Design a protein around this ligand. Structure first.
Ligand SMILES: CN(C)C(=N)NC(=N)N
Length: 456
């Protein structure tokens, strides 16, 4: 189906943009680059795993990995007077007493490729800027979910969608060529503006075309196109290690889509009072609005939360991610079936409870049981996927046609606000205690579970 394919491609191409940070911006293990260590290593013959025993701050209670990652012994490594057995025994009565400094001269990264982290040195004190990368995108989303309606009111639909697709394709391509963090964040923001606009527009068009009976099914099929997008993201990120190659390979298809769309007649897609206060005027409607806002926020937070957490902590990222993407499909069938069989409130509650429990269990798990961790992670991802499917319908059902679209605009803006807050909770906060983010996700999931039961 051409008329179906041309929109599902525009859904599948959105997933590499939203989640791509997990592959464009991994943080590999690193230590302070150390001038003269290469010379002393050449003299003494230290192998890669051996040099880190003698040339980096040692681990201890409470890890001390921060010292290894962000400090270095200020030793005169050029000295041939140093012992090749262990130079630090020649220099101090105890290693603890050596002079220590910051990595003034550079960084060494254990990867054959590169990521934005490795390429702009977003390590140690700079590491917040990495969360600033995903935050700028979700800020683009927030400005999109509100400004796109006004724009499309003031600018013609065909012109609007042509513009936003061209700008998405270009800005995504140009991001690969950004030479500095400022320009990269600006392209990330422009793409944040236009990507959600395109995604919502394509969704609207596909649901406007398909008959009202099949429309509901086609919505879930359009979601599953996102999962196929995640699978493609994994494949490309495995074939193309350097983040620029990946960014081009991700962006190009949306460019070629315009070279296709212009070459053949596709005009029907574009050719074919509400007030914010009225969403709150009455206490029951107001309460339901608050609940839907909360649940959209919670599921956004948990979805990006689990994906970024996995990106930050998984030991076999590519298969830990592949086996997680391919779980949304069974999740989609479980959703569609259960929606038809017994409704939507009980599934949305149970699936949020399942997500909360899965997050909580990941606190207690012994992490060497990688096979258990990946299973619980999959159970969580399935849960939050089913909940997102359910709430996409429930947010239509609980608002009347007089305000339904404004309710969607609100809820989506709440999702984008959660997308803005989630990164700093996942990374910039995780350095306090690795349980913390999972405690938050557990609490959020359990509350979303309990709160859900109040909806009619
Ligand atoms: C993570 N976000 C906000 C998405 N674009 N995807 C989704 N289906 N919610």
């Amino acid at each position: 189906k051409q008329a179906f394919l041309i929109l599902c491609l525009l859904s599948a191409a959105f997933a590499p943009i939203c989640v791509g940070i997990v592959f464009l911006g991994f943080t590999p293990d690193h230590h302070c680059q150390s001038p003269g260590v290469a010379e002393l290593s050449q003299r003494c013959g230290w192998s890669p795993a051996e040099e880190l025993n003698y040339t980096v701050p040692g681990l201890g209670p409470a890890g001390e990995a921060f010292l290894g990652q962000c400090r270095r012994y200020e030793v005169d490594w050029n000295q041939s007077a140093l012992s090749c057995v262990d130079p630090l025994a020649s220099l101090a009565t105890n290693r603890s007493h050596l002079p220590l400094g910051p990595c003034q001269d550079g960084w060494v990264y254990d990867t054959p490729g590169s990521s934005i982290v490795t390429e702009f040195n977003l390590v140690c004190a700079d590491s917040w800027k990495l969360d600033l990368f995903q935050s700028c995108l979700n800020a683009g989303f927030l400005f999109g979910s509100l400004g796109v309606g006004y724009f499309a009111d003031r600018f013609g639909r065909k012109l609007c969608l042509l513009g936003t697709v061209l700008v998405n394709a270009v800005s995504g391509v140009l991001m690969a060529f950004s030479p500095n963090y400022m320009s990269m964040l600006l392209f990330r923001l422009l793409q944040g503006l236009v990507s959600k606009g395109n995604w919502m527009a394509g969704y609207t068009l596909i649901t406007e075309f398909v008959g009202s009976g099949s429309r509901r099914t086609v919505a879930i099929m359009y979601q599953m196109a996102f999962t196929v997008g995640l699978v493609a993201l994994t494949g490309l990120a495995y074939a193309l290690p350097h983040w620029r190659w990946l960014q081009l390979a991700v962006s190009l298809p949306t460019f070629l889509f315009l070279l296709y769309y212009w070459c053949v007649p596709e005009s029907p897609r574009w050719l074919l009072s509400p007030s914010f206060a009225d969403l709150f005027r009455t206490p029951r409607l107001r309460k339901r609005t608050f609940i839907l806002m909360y649940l959209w926020f919670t599921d956004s937070v948990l979805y990006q939360g689990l994906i970024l957490h996995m990106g930050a902590t998984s030991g076999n990222l590519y298969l830990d991610f592949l086996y997680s993407a391919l779980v949304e499909i069974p999740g989609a069938f479980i959703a569609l079936i259960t929606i038809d069989r017994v409704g939507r409130i009980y599934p949305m509650a149970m699936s949020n409870l399942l997500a909360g429990a899965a997050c909580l269990v990941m606190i207690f798990i012994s992490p060497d049981l990688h096979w258990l961790n990946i299973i619980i992670m999959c159970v969580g991802r399935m849960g939050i996927t089913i909940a997102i499917q359910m709430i996409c319908l429930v947010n239509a059902e609980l608002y009347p046609t007089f305000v339904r679209n404004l309710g969607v605009m609100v809820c989506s803006s709440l999702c984008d606000i959660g997308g803005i807050i989630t990164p700093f909770i996942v990374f910039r906060l995780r350095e306090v205690w690795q349980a913390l983010p999972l405690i938050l996700f557990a609490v959020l999931g359990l509350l979303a579970a309990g709160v859900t039961l109040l909806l009619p």
